[PDB]
Design an enzyme around this catalytic site. Structure first.
Site, short mmCIF file in Angstrom:
data_model
loop_
_atom_site.label_atom_id
_atom_site.label_comp_id
_atom_site.label_asym_id
_atom_site.label_seq_id
_atom_site.Cartn_x
_atom_site.Cartn_y
_atom_site.Cartn_z
CG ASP A 230 -38.77 -1.44 -29.62
OD1 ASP A 230 -39.22 -0.31 -29.36
OD2 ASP A 230 -39.37 -2.49 -29.35
CB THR A 231 -37.18 4.39 -29.59
OG1 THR A 231 -38.53 4.44 -30.06
CG2 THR A 231 -36.25 4.73 -30.74
N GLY A 232 -38.76 1.96 -27.87
CA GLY A 232 -39.65 1.66 -26.77
C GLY A 232 -39.10 0.63 -25.80
C1 LIG Z 1 -47.59 -2.59 -29.28
C2 LIG Z 1 -46.53 -3.67 -29.31
C3 LIG Z 1 -45.13 -3.05 -29.28
C4 LIG Z 1 -43.98 -4.07 -29.35
C5 LIG Z 1 -44.00 -4.87 -30.66
C6 LIG Z 1 -42.94 -5.96 -30.76
C7 LIG Z 1 -43.14 -6.72 -32.06
C8 LIG Z 1 -42.66 -6.17 -33.25
C9 LIG Z 1 -42.84 -6.84 -34.45
C10 LIG Z 1 -43.49 -8.07 -34.47
C11 LIG Z 1 -43.96 -8.63 -33.28
C12 LIG Z 1 -43.79 -7.95 -32.07
C13 LIG Z 1 -42.66 -3.30 -29.23
C14 LIG Z 1 -42.26 -2.94 -27.81
O1 LIG Z 1 -41.43 -1.92 -27.68
C15 LIG Z 1 -42.70 -3.66 -26.74
C16 LIG Z 1 -42.27 -3.41 -25.30
C17 LIG Z 1 -42.18 -1.93 -24.89
C18 LIG Z 1 -43.51 -1.19 -24.93
C19 LIG Z 1 -40.99 -4.16 -24.99
C20 LIG Z 1 -40.12 -4.58 -26.00
C21 LIG Z 1 -38.95 -5.27 -25.68
C22 LIG Z 1 -38.64 -5.53 -24.35
C23 LIG Z 1 -39.48 -5.11 -23.33
N1 LIG Z 1 -39.15 -5.39 -22.03
S1 LIG Z 1 -38.30 -4.34 -21.13
O2 LIG Z 1 -38.04 -4.94 -19.84
O3 LIG Z 1 -37.12 -3.99 -21.91
C24 LIG Z 1 -39.30 -3.07 -21.01
C25 LIG Z 1 -40.36 -3.08 -20.08
C26 LIG Z 1 -41.24 -1.99 -20.03
C27 LIG Z 1 -41.07 -0.91 -20.90
C28 LIG Z 1 -42.02 0.26 -20.90
F1 LIG Z 1 -41.49 1.38 -21.35
F2 LIG Z 1 -42.99 -0.07 -21.74
F3 LIG Z 1 -42.56 0.46 -19.71
C29 LIG Z 1 -40.01 -0.96 -21.81
N2 LIG Z 1 -39.17 -2.01 -21.86
C30 LIG Z 1 -40.65 -4.43 -23.66
C31 LIG Z 1 -43.60 -4.79 -26.98
O4 LIG Z 1 -43.97 -5.57 -26.12
O5 LIG Z 1 -44.10 -5.03 -28.30
#
Ligand SMILES: CCC[C@@]1(CCc2ccccc2)CC(O)=C([C@H](CC)c2cccc(NS(=O)(=O)c3ccc(C(F)(F)F)cn3)c2)C(=O)O1
Ligand SMILES: [Cl-]
Ligand SMILES: [Cl-]
EC number: 3.4.23.16
Lengths: 99, 99
Positions: free
Chosen positions: B25-27
């Site tokens: 997950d690059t996000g």
């Molecule tokens: C549109 C939903 C996208 C996603 C789906 C996950 C999923 C996949 C398959 C089945 C069910 C669910 C993947 C994802 O990257 C995130 C977010 C980032 C947008 C995410 C994922 C993991 C950890 C975090 N928390 S964090 O503290 O590492 C963090 C906080 C904020 C951000 C920012 F870039 F979005 F700001 C990125 N990372 C957030 C999420 O919340 O759900």
């Protein structure tokens, strides 16, 4: 381009003639944008993220440019913390993961 | 490898003596795994994403192998709906986005 991951992969997108910042997210099936207005009809969808589920509005066949690359596809709109480009559009612009 | 995005980029990881399936997950800033035991010290953390925040345990300096590539980093453990490999470990295996 090649995008490394030392920082968030944030890029400029263009949608409805306006520029926005969005996150290239290989863990997202779908593209989800923060609240905004889009033309046409919409349908309901519930999607899951790391924190639980959100309700979004689904718009189909929307023109959207991602890092200068033109895509036309489904855009979801709802209470996401950031604009997210998911696999539906990442595949349209020819994105892969490489290591 | 070169991993396309037609489907979820799921790979095998090795961590804490276990083999698991996880999403590249690059996000995601961070790596977050479903409930499991890990050795050593931990502290609580709140992480937010789509759907809001979850409380996790933060374990630092954890050895991991992702799709055959070794790394070390922080691993969070909590009620994520899927195991997620985030940028903190993707960088270490040399993972990039390309288009
Ligand atoms: C549109 C939903 C996208 C996603 C789906 C996950 C999923 C996949 C398959 C089945 C069910 C669910 C993947 C994802 O990257 C995130 C977010 C980032 C947008 C995410 C994922 C993991 C950890 C975090 N928390 S964090 O503290 O590492 C963090 C906080 C904020 C951000 C920012 F870039 F979005 F700001 C990125 N990372 C957030 C999420 O919340 O759900
Ligand atoms: Cl689409
Ligand atoms: Cl780390």
């Amino acid at each position: 381009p090649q995008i490394t991951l030392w920082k968030r992969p944030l890029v400029t997108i263009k949608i409805g003639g306006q520029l926005k910042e969005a996150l290239l997210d290989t863990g997202a099936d779908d593209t989800v944008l923060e609240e905004m207005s889009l033309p046409g009809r919409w349908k309901p969808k519930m999607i899951g993220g790391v924190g639980g589920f959100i309700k979004v509005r689904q718009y189909d066949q929307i023109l959207i440019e991602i890092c200068g690359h033109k895509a036309i596809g489904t855009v979801l709109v709802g209470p996401t913390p950031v604009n997210i480009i998911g696999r539906n559009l990442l595949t349209q612009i020819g994105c892969t993961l490489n290591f």
